[PDB]
């Protein structure tokens, strides 16, 4: 019922985004706050 | 040989300055650098 080009390509890009987000959230952004340090005694 | 007013008053003020400097150096300025602290980790 839907268009040929739309569903397949949109689903593929959505799955790619999900995979990239999973990898980045699991690994890259885990210690964004714990390792965030400033040069001060305050 | 010198003037009446000069020697006595100058000597008294000089001795006063010496005593004040002795007290201040012994006590007030002893930890001017050791207790000098800045708010930084540098």
Swiss-Prot record, chains A, B:
Family label: Belongs to the connexin family. Beta-type (group I) subfamily.
Disease: Charcot-Marie-Tooth disease, X-linked dominant, 1: A form of Charcot-Marie-Tooth disease, a disorder of the peripheral nervous system, characterized by progressive weakness and atrophy, initially of the peroneal muscles and later of the distal muscles of the arms. Dejerine-Sottas syndrome: A severe degenerating neuropathy of the demyelinating Charcot-Marie-Tooth disease category, with onset by age 2 years. Characterized by motor and sensory neuropathy with very slow nerve conduction velocities, increased cerebrospinal fluid protein concentrations, hypertrophic nerve changes, delayed age of walking as well as areflexia. There are both autosomal dominant and autosomal recessive forms of Dejerine-Sottas syndrome.
Signal peptide (from-to): none
Gene name tied to this protein: GJB1
Effect of mutating residue 25 to V: In CMTX1; localized in the Golgi apparatus without reaching the cell membrane
Binding partners and assembly: A connexon is composed of a hexamer of connexins. Interacts with CNST.
Transmembrane segments: 8-30
Effect of residue 11 to W: In CMTX1; severe
Its job: One gap junction consists of a cluster of closely packed pairs of transmembrane channels, the connexons, through which materials of low MW diffuse from one cell to a neighboring cell.
This protein's name: Gap junction beta-1 protein
Location(s) in or outside the cell: Cell membrane; Cell junction, Gap junction
Annotated phenotype, changing residue 22 to M: In CMTX1; localized in the Golgi apparatus but also forming rare small gap junction-like plaques
Covered residues, full protein: 16 to 57 of 283
């Amino acid at each position: 019922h839907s268009t040929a080009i739309g569903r397949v390509w949109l689903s593929v890009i959505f799955i790619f985004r999900i995979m990239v987000l999973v990898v980045a959230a699991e690994s890259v952004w885990g210690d964004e706050k714990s390792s965030f340090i400033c040069n001060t005694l305050q």
